[PDB]
């Protein structure tokens, strides 16, 4: 099983009328932080090394895990004094990774993915994204892929009916990004438009929630009792 980088350094929730102070991955989900439930699932999947890539309120998150760590996997921390963006965060985490490939997950997402099958599907690529097929994709960003599942573009939310959720979970070869010329950048907005290698989606019907979406918060609290 690959090393996992969890991106958890962004600000609190930002909705049209509501702004949060707590980091989104630390929202309480029926007695445990959302992040803890993600980490527990990863440990169940065989993950032995988790890197938490932090910035906003990094000391709050670390202090929480020092006191109550839900897993026995190794847990490393990397603190960004100034937010490096999602892409800069990944580039920065490459320092810690000795292997040629690793997993990136957004800390505000919880997906009951089969990571062994995801790794197998990624063997012939340097970048693979997890796409989640749902009957109603309206509240999610989605993926525009062709009939070989090559990713053509990322689509903004606001689309009724079926679609493939842009999960933000990737398997990548660190060589594609470790030496990206900028230290601060967005993975989706700066890196992906430039990347010229093979980029396909692993598409499954896995359970998916994004804790930044209010309806998914209620779904999560109900799911975990
Ligand atoms: N370490 C780090 N993480 C970040 C940064 N920006 C965002 N993140 C994290 O990366 C994930 C995705 O962030 P973002 O794409 O901005 O959020 P979204 N999917 O648009 O709501 C979140 O879990 C967030 O905490 C950053 O500058 N540094
Ligand atoms: Mg969000």
Residue numbers in the entry: 1 to 225
The authors write:
Here, we report the crystal structure of YpHddC complexed with guanosine-5′-(β-amino)-diphosphate (GMPPN), a GTP analogue, to elucidate the structure-function relationship of YpHddC. The phases were obtained by a molecular replacement method and refined to 1.55 Å resolution. The extra densities were well matched with one magnesium, one GMPPN, and two citrate molecules. Ala8, Gly9, and Gly10 experience an induced-fit conformational change when they interact with GMPPN in the crystal structure. In detail, an oxyanion hole-like conformation was induced by the three rearranged backbone nitrogen atoms. Consequently, the induced oxyanion hole attracts the O2′ oxygen atom of the ribose moiety of GMPPN. L6 contains Glu80 which is a key residue to interact with GMPPN. Two oxygens of the Glu80, Oε1, and Oε2, make interactions with N2 and N1 atoms of guanine with the distances of 2.84 Å and 2.79 Å, respectively. It means that the binding of the base portion of GTP follows a lock-and-key mechanism contrast to the triphosphate portion requiring an induced-fit docking. The stabilized citrate molecule plays as a tridentate ligand and seizes a six-coordinated magnesium ion.
